Amino acid sequence: KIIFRLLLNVLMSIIAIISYQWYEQLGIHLTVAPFSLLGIAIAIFLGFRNSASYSRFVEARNLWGTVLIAERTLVRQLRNILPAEHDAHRRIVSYLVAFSWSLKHQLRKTDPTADLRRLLPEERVTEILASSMPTNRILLLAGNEIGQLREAGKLSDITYGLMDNKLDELAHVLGGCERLATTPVPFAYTLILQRTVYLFCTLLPFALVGDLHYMTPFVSVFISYTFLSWDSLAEELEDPFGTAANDLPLNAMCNTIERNLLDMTGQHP
Amino acid sequence: IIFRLLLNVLMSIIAIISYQWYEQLGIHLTVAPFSLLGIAIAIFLGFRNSASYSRFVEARNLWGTVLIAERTLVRQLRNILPAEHDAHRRIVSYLVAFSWSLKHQLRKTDPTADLRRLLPEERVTEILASSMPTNRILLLAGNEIGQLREAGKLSDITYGLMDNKLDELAHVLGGCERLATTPVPFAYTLILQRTVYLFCTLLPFALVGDLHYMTPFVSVFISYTFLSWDSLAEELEDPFGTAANDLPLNAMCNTIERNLLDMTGQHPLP
Amino acid sequence: SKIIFRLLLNVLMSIIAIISYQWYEQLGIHLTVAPFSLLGIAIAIFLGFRNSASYSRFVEARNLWGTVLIAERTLVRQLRNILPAEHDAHRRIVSYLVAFSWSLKHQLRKTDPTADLRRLLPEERVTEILASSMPTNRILLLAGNEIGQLREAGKLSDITYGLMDNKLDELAHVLGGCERLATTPVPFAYTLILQRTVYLFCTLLPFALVGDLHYMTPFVSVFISYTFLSWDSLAEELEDPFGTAANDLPLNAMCNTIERNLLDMTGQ
Amino acid sequence: SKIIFRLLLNVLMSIIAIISYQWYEQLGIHLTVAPFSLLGIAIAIFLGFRNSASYSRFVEARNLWGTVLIAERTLVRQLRNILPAEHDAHRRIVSYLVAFSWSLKHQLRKTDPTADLRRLLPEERVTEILASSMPTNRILLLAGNEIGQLREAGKLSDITYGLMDNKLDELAHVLGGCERLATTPVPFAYTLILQRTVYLFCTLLPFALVGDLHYMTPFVSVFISYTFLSWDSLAEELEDPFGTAANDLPLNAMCNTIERNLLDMTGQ
Amino acid sequence: SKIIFRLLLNVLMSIIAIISYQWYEQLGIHLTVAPFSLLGIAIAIFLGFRNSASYSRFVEARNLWGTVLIAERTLVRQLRNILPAEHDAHRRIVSYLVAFSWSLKHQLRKTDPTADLRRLLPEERVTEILASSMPTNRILLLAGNEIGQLREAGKLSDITYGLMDNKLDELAHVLGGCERLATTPVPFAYTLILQRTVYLFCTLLPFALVGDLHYMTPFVSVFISYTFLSWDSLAEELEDPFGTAANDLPLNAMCNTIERNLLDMTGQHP
């Protein structure tokens, strides 16, 4: 809907053109210089803001990359260290796959019930849904699988530890994503910028008309487009787990993770 | 902040009525020098705000680590010692006490009620007697893990896995303390703030020659932009400070407590 | 560089601006420099921040590849220090580590890894690796099998097994990092906004300059265009670090360095 | 603040500009604001990036010192948790850890650590530490020996020995980091460039403003100068973090805090 | 710094602008300040980012070298703490660690490491190291063999071997980090764009300023030129942190410091 404010800006320019006649007869003067000062200041602030928004997006993408890496290596360790424990391989993989989908639902604020039931027995589904953090309970359940292998003497404390480390890595991902989801960049940044950029763009033609006359709408819309484009891009990057164009394709990412883990456990889709 | 905008409107009205006597004295104010001054100030505000934002982000990262480390420690205790519930409860109590005590320390509020709610009075007295109560809580959590080791319930290896988590917490405590004693700039920030203020108040006098009656509208818009950006950096620089929003810190301490009670079967109701 | 075309086009736009400046008043068009200074400075600021992001992405790609060389060197060092007599195991693992590098290279370039793999590995494993949808990952799994067997045979203890397992983790992070950089680009809306904005700005500029500069319009306009276009195109080249373009990573040379290193450390 | 001298000098330059503005035309000399806006903006940008480097360096220094407290707190926690009955060992190790902090402070301040060391350690150990060309590093060695003896006596296993040795490693990173910051400044050519341009800019400024401002020249010229100088001086204050001045790190108080923490945790 | 030539050259361009400003109309040349303010500000922004990127490479390079000192100190400390009586092993390992630093320096400076190697190690080892296409890597391998042999002889357990092995890994990361900075420069089109652009801008500048500044043209033009040229050449110097220029790393002094540390008092420890 950025196109709406561009069209609206064209209308404000036309108002600026038709009312420029009555400018002197009202006592209003508007030069370009003060608006260059204001405009450059806003651009500087948009530049820094946009940079921060991009960094949050990059970090979110990084965290999701770590899910894939840590889950691959955990399965790799299980196969290298306990090549014959295939039942354990399957149970742990189902938890690792459930973890990814559940993380996705947590970040999207959606119901993980259907995905959980496709992957896990109903008793486990109930236990997981009852927790205030189902992704955390899933890590705990995956941990019990490894813990029981340890108690049975199949894993030593050392080899248990190598795998426990991967669960710590997933916990770090969970916390990182939760931090990015609960933290926006402070609201007062968009509040300043969104209101400020819009007000600036609509007032601009009134300041340009004295110099540009009929050429006001073209130059005004070009300037507005530049500022609005840069501003709206930051808003989209600030919410990496959202549904908007340039947000993370979390569903495709979860599919990739699941396909990887079924590839390493001899299963076919 | 709304007050200085009103003050800026007041300065504009003064600028408008007094612009008359300007020539008969020889005083001039053009836009170009204030354009120079304004852009330089905007540049400095950008860099300043960048540093402030960096401090805000680190504060959230440190707090994110409390939640991560405490979750995994409790996970390890269940996976490695599933039957040691007395130990689970005592350790959970210390970890929860650690979070609340850390919050109170950074906010300079009294941690007594949270401590008495969570721990036996003997320990509360010991903790309150220390000049570093949050560190003492980590020490007490360490004793719990250490006792399990002497009892032969943890090996040196599995002890080590849990000890690492207490280390993550010590790093959080030190990092927050460093962030609290901060700021880095030696209150040269006060200068920078005043500079923005003087600029906003002198501005209508520099614009009035060009803008005339339209001066207060344009002058207040520009002031609003600079003052807002300045106050945002001020808020970001002091994430644990005197005039800060307590909702996330409170939400985090509540979140970790709810998680750990969930992980130890203390929730739901039987 | 096809920038020379857009500069020549800019020279043409300037001459048009010069000859048509006559009809400016008779059309009602006024163009001053001040609004374009505002727009130009805004574009420069956004280009600066964008170029910064492109550079960092290029730098990360570079770092990831540096890690391949480091991790593979130390894994081989550990094998020699810990199991100096196990040369059969050395040779097998080295072939897997070298194959990992080439396979990663081919994957990022979207080229066929077959000859490099057949040169390094027996055909039996090659078919197995190529049968997977994630061949580079399958190679790490196979390298892991070698180390796991040394452990089961009692040649490695759990501790020394762990020391080497850590290096395989370091390689897994590299694989994930590179894949992330390959699938996730700097968002395409950075390019669209900036390319449209920079090009339109450069072509409209002489029409705004002509009133002040007159005949001097094309020289000053092309200089400004060149400055913006050069900086913009630099970001384009940095944004695709795994590509074939001259200012891209010398991945072929890097893989050769890695292979020469690992055969140097094994008397090969 | 000796910034006031440069402001007073700036007031004088403004007065000269006002009274000498008459002979401006009779010489053919003009100074407009526009070129000084360009120059001023460029200088502001470079001052920004520079202060950014000065700031990061000061922050790192504070970070390094923060780590001393964390690592020493945890080492003592480990000693209590793992060896609750070994109080003699607790005291000896604590005295080395406290000595390490004071010795680091003296090294960075280039002061004599002898009195602090004698307060903490037996004279034999003091002699041994001071005989070294790197006394703070030698203190880490001695702390490692205490831990090493516990390992040899069987009170620490290799695992628990390793847990504590890791903390000595963190301290080694602090020592090297501080030494690196002490010898490596923000490069001097940044300060030299900036110092030369900022001073010249502020003194030339009133001559460039007088044509526009007339009688208001000293007030606006001083405002602008104060703004650049305040920002420039901020770097000056951040650049010497290990010094004694009021805006430098309170290393003495920091060392006292470290010592009080460690004696709180050992019942002293 | 060859900036002094281009500054003097810029003064000449100003005098040309002053003497030819009358003839501007008779040639059809008009040049205002506004377009050059736009162009100059864009260049300053780009120079700012470029210099920031150059400084970061410098900082990383200094950090990698700091790690050599740290990792080598702790490796020697560990050897003294864990195997206090193995002085023959201490000496051999220290000589490899010292050779590693000097060999790294020569590799980055593209100089011959032969003399330094012969000074520190027996000739048999020198030939083995010189025979490798990567001598610094071969030195780490030899330092690793020493540790590996202590392990095989039962003097180190797998655990204590691992503690020392970690430090050799830390050194491998330094070697790789330095090679990455050395084999890859910032892209060569950074140097090309900016140098041509800054120079062309500075020489064209007086022709645009003279209409405003008249006789003051050479002074203001050279001032602006000095600011842009200095910032540009400093960035060029920092991008090559292993080079010989004055703002580059004192690698020789750093290697001497490392050598003096590890050989502090005839290698004698308590």
Ligand SMILES: [Zn+2]
């Ligand atoms: Zn990992």
Ligand SMILES: [Zn+2]
């Ligand atoms: Zn299986």
Ligand SMILES: [Zn+2]
């Ligand atoms: Zn952790």
Ligand SMILES: [Zn+2]
């Ligand atoms: Zn329990």
Ligand SMILES: [Zn+2]
């Ligand atoms: Zn609950």
Ligand SMILES: [Zn+2]
């Ligand atoms: Zn490594």
Ligand SMILES: [Zn+2]
């Ligand atoms: Zn071999």
Ligand SMILES: [Zn+2]
């Ligand atoms: Zn064989």
Ligand SMILES: [Zn+2]
């Ligand atoms: Zn093929």
Ligand SMILES: [Zn+2]
């Ligand atoms: Zn630590």
Ligand SMILES: [Zn+2]
């Ligand atoms: Zn004690």
Ligand SMILES: [Zn+2]
């Ligand atoms: Zn000082």
Ligand SMILES: [Zn+2]
């Ligand atoms: Zn280290």
Ligand SMILES: [Zn+2]
């Ligand atoms: Zn010795």
Ligand SMILES: [Zn+2]
């Ligand atoms: Zn003249």
